[PDB]
Amino acid sequence: ATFEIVNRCSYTVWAAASKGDAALDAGGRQLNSGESWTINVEPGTKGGKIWARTDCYFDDSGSGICKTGDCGGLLRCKRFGRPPTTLAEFSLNQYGKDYIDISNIKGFNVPMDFSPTTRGCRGVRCAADIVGQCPAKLKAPGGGCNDACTVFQTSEYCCTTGKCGPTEYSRFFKRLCPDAFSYVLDKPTTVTCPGSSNYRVTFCPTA
Numbered sequence: 699a700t701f702e703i704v705n706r707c708s709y710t711v712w713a714a715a716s717k718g719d720a721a722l723d724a725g726g727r728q729l730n731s732g733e734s735w736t737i738n739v740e741p742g743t744k745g746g747k748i749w750a751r752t753d754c755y756f757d758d759s760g761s762g763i764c765k766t767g768d769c770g771g772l773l774r775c776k777r778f779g780r781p782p783t784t785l786a787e788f789s790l791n792q793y794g795k796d797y798i799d800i801s802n803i804k805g806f807n808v809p810m811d812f813s814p815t816t817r818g819c820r821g822v823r824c825a826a827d828i829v830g831q832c833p834a835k836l837k838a839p840g841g842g843c844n845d846a847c848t849v850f851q852t853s854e855y856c857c858t859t860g861k862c863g864p865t866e867y868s869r870f871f872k873r874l875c876p877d878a879f880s881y882v883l884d885k886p887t888t889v890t891c892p893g894s895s896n897y898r899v900t901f902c903p904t905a
Contacts (some may be wrong), residue, residue, distance in 0.1 A: 699790055702815065703738045703748060705729035707902035711808060712751040712764060716776040717740070722746060724772035729901075741894060742789050748786040748899050749779050750808040752841050765840035766807040776888040781805040782842030782880075784824060786812040790848075791893040798897070799888045800824050800878040802871040806832075807842035811903040819891035824875035825904050833870055845871075847882075856881035 699726060701723075703713045710730050710866035714739055715722035723737035751767035760773040767783040769775035782805025790796040799822060800812055806828040813821030832843035847856035854862050862883055864872070872880035877887050 699741065699743075699894060700736060700796075700904045701739055702750065702817070702896075702898045703729070704732055704734045704898060705731055705809065706786075706898040706900050706905045707712060707731060707810050707901070708905060711901055712754045712756075712767075712773070712806075713748065713899075713901075714751055714767060714769055714779055715746070715748045716769065716778055717743060717777045718778055719776070721774055721776045722748075725746050725776055726751075726769070726770070726837075727773075738823070739790065744789040744792070746788045746790070747778060748812075749783040750810075751779065754808055754899065766838070766842045779804075780798075781848045782807045782838050784843045786806050786810060788897075788900050794893050796891045796893055796895050797888050798812050798822065798891060799886070800875075801877060802828075802878045802880055803845055803882060804848075805842055806871070807847045808901050809898045809903060811858075811898075813898050813900075814891050815896045815898050816892070819889050819895070822877050822887065822889055823831075823903065824878040825902075826874035828874055831870075831874070833867065835868065845881075855881075866877070 751764040753763035756762035767779035868881035
């Protein structure tokens with residue numbers, strides 16, 4: 699399948715695409731404003747993620763640091779990103795369908811649209827100034843708006859036992875992006891698409 703990752707923000711991002719234990723395609727790439735990076739993801743991939751990283755430095759080989767979303771200090775992510783990271787999430791060709799979501803369960807750094815480029819299903823977006831509003835205890839120095847489970851490490855926020863409810867903090871993310879997951883047991887805002895769909899991720903969409 700095809701992912702076209704478009705930086706419509708006015709600042710550079712360092713896009714990342716991982717499943718957790720391996721890169722997807724090249725695993726990451728600088729995107730200056732306006733730049734598109736199309737990747738190939740296999741069919742049947744489960745639990746894939748695409749995110750932005752901000753305020754990075756990488757040296758000639760590729761090792762470095764970012765202030766949001768860092769994946770073990772690699773330009774080319776083979777693992778997931780340090781919060782706060784707005785997340786595009788997907789598992790493809792499940793049993794005849796792909797399933798797409800955007801998640802604020804690790805926080806928020808960059809606004810995002812995650813739309814299918816082929817018919818049958820509808821996209822999902824979170825574009826609200828979450829970082830401008832973000833509650834003080836959830837602010838991340840380095841940039842972004844952390845989730846409560848990152849800031850406090852409780853069973854209730856982290857839904858550790860498989861039981862939890864919404865919270866004042868989950869609800870701050872759900873007021874601003876009803877169409878993204880705001881905590882682990884949120885009513886799912888997943889989208890079911892035909893198997894083998896293609897997609898566009900766009901950062902700052904409304905930019």
